[PDB]
């Protein structure tokens with residue numbers, strides 16, 4: 001059965017609620033983004049209206065085979081009427097196609113559901129500037145002050161410089177990047193661009209990237225692995241055994257691998273600056289863990305919320321333990337006393 005924080009009161013709507021069968025009273029199911037924890041349940045057999053971005057719609061059609069008649073893509077930044085209720089979709093700064101949803105309820109209440117997001121000051125100049133929000137359904141993934149990490153731009157600078165230096169010293173090195181979902185495509189795109197290479201990958205991953213509306217994509221990716229010196233592999237293969245095994249397949253073209261595992265936050269963020277990061281190395285294989293996040297840092301979250309001044313906050317992440325719930329409520333009250341709302 002569907003939990004409370006996935007329902008939008010005073011509507012027939014749910015958000016990211018596909019794993020509970022038929023939800024009583026639901027006339028439209030919204031999907032914020034194409035990540036498995038959120039789409040869990042959708043398939044070719046789904047017969048209710050799905051509302052989402054264009055990119056999420058391309059993924060539902062091609063990857064999950066949802067029929068065309070049930071996919072309802074909406075443009076961003078545009079007031080739309082769904083089942084008699086005004087909605088807006090906004091860019092969430094998460095993965096490709098990810099949105100926040102603003103709902104203008106019939107009784108005058110305004111609700112923002114962030115989905116998964118990486119808060120940014122640019123959001124203070126969207127359609128949110130205008131107006132009051134009575135309820136915030138908030139992505140609280142990193143809602144504690146120990147969660148620190150650098151800007152995506154600093155992390156990409158480190159990856160480009162690391163890869164460019166290694167391949168310039170050794171023209172016979174291969175670069176490998178781990179993936180297990182959509183998101184974080186800038187990591188492998190930026191490395192391939194500095195090296196003058198296309199990115200090589202499986203047919204399944206290629207299909208996924210072809211759904212993403214990335215400009216000039218045909219110029220950037222390929223299924224011909226042998227033509228490419230940046231390869232993508234599933235994240236589970238990014239270890240010394242999996243990488244050794246991969247090097248055997250390349251027919252004596254390469255004599256070194258440099259590999260990247262983009263992660264979220266890890267405890268080494270508590271101690272080591274991005275500049276000072278070093279790899280794990282065995283023989284001719286080196287593996288870098290790089291902290292490329294598509295969720296808000298504590299400080300980014302706090303700034304967004306103190307700006308928005310919502311009347312009530314409903315967390316959507318870390319809701320399963322009393323200690324997590326209590327900790328998050330304490331921070332919401334500090335923020336509110338500090339800023340005065």
Ligand code: NI
Nearest residue numbers: 033035094116
């Ligand atoms: Ni996500």
